[PDB]
Amino acid sequence: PVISNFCMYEFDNRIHAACKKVEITYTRYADDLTFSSNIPDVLKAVPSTLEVLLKDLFGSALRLNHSKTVFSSKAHNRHVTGITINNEETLSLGRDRKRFIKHLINQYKYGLLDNEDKAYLIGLLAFASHIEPSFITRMNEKYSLELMERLRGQR
DNA sequence: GGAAGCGAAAGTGTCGCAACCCGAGAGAGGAACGATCTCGGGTTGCGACACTTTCGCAACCCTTAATACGTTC
């Protein structure tokens, strides 16, 4: 991990320098470059810059995956490395995963959840508390605080 | 990267069919010799197709891993 992070220090530096001037923010989760901007029609020129910079730096060894270059906007689904970005500009787990968690909690309410799926739900609710804290409060309202306390951590 | 099978893709040879040629022959006419149409091989050109070669998909996972619960690469 650290070797791969260092091998793209110059790539990250050049991309960030050339990308912040056009008002585009750039990140990389070590294999997955993310660009976003509030200015329309400026991201369409980024993949060519990425390709030419990769050729300049790594030659032919490192290259983009042209089948994995995805454009998106508020008209479509928006998720960055597993977290859905709402139309309200807030982080979320997505409607489908939040309904899945609701189904799991409802199953636990009636004692239809075995040990393995109970552990999976406690793990997923820890992750949900990390990503979307308001979901925990909403589930406390929906499924009562006592039931959530019995499932989640008690000490 | 690439077993083992197998099939795609492209190139090359081959082999049968058509088209023509060429000698032999019975004998039209009409009064003889041999016109003319056919029989039997033989040659060549051509194109469809069979055969030949190369490439590429992707087993396994090497001695050599860790094992609370969840996302991410």
Side-chain angles (χ1 to χ4, degrees):
Chain A
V2 65
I3 302 302
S4 66
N5 263 359
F6 157 70
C7 285
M8 293 177 70
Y9 172 84
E10 187 61 26
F11 177 85
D12 286 342
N13 209 358
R14 300 251 276 276
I15 279 295
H16 193 77
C19 183
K20 201 173 71 81
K21 293 186 284 186
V22 65
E23 183 178 1
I24 307 183
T25 187
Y26 161 74
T27 61
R28 176 182 64 91
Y29 206 80
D31 203 6
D32 198 69
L33 283 72
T34 314
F35 308 84
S36 48
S37 176
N38 282 309
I39 310 182
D41 308 291
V42 303
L43 290 166
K44 65 179 73 174
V46 174
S48 296
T49 299
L50 292 158
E51 274 164 81
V52 302
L53 189 49
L54 284 170
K55 184 177 180 180
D56 175 312
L57 293 187
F58 311 100
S60 168
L62 208 76
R63 67 184 68 188
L64 281 175
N65 210 349
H66 295 119
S67 57
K68 292 181 181 179
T69 301
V70 193
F71 292 79
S72 196
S73 77
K74 288 174 71 175
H76 326 281
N77 190 13
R78 277 160 62 230
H79 61 95
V80 171
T81 188
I83 311 297
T84 310
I85 316 177
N86 284 1
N87 292 356
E88 321 287 350
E89 293 179 353
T90 188
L91 295 195
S92 158
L93 292 192
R95 180 197 181 71
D96 284 1
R97 186 179 295 276
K98 287 193 297 224
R99 302 252 283 187
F100 171 52
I101 291 166
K102 287 194 283 184
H103 159 82
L104 283 178
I105 302 166
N106 183 58
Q107 293 270 286
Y108 178 72
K109 182 174 73 175
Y110 298 113
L112 297 169
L113 182 63
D114 46 320
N115 265 349
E116 65 183 1
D117 302 280
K118 183 176 176 178
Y120 171 75
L121 172 69
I122 299 141
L124 294 174
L125 279 165
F127 170 70
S129 181
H130 179 49
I131 294 307
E132 208 175 1
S134 79
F135 187 65
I136 305 307
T137 290
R138 291 201 280 261
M139 289 311 100
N140 285 359
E141 315 170 352
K142 181 172 173 65
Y143 293 111
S144 66
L145 188 43
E146 157 77 9
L147 176 66
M148 301 312 271
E149 280 176 32
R150 308 201 335 251
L151 172 83
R152 295 179 66 250
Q154 70 275 17
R155 183 176 177 87

